[PDB]
Amino acid sequence: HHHHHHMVHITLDRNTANSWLIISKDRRQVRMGDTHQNVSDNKERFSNYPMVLGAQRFSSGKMYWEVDVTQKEAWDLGVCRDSVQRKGQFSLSPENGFWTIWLWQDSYEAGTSPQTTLHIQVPPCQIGIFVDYEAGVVSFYNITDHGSLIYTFSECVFAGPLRPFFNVGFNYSGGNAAPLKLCPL
């Protein structure tokens, strides 16, 4: 791919974070805390899962960013509608306003309904996310494997402004504490 020149500087929005997340001072890293992080509740916060949104909203153009997933066992990444449900239980699907991939129990899957198996030969340490708003495309790239394509959502019906979407995943196992990090441009 040759999408690197649409690079955007993403920062995390504290106010959208699950109350157990710890976001770094620079707003570029997020990890699971071992307890509630002593913040007030609000209608924006994801309640059921360890999720947070980027601050940036996109309604046009081409955008690209990279995320470090080194040594994590579980995570979700992609984009979502600004209007997605925050409270209670829901599935990650385009019908619910999410265009995502994930790692879970040693398999990679795209968040279609039902989910799609991904064929990754080189487990990624960094993931590239490309959005073309006008084209209706969200693509995922394996930066560890020379930028190889992971998955393309096409014919997307965004139906609103998009936000970068993150899930650090639970840490029941003690093997998933590592952060998600937004990688430098």
Ligand SMILES: CCc1nc(Cn2ccccc2=O)no1
């Ligand atoms: C949304 C609630 C929540 N709790 C935790 C953190 N947590 C707590 C116990 C066991 C595993 C584990 O990951 N993360 O989200």
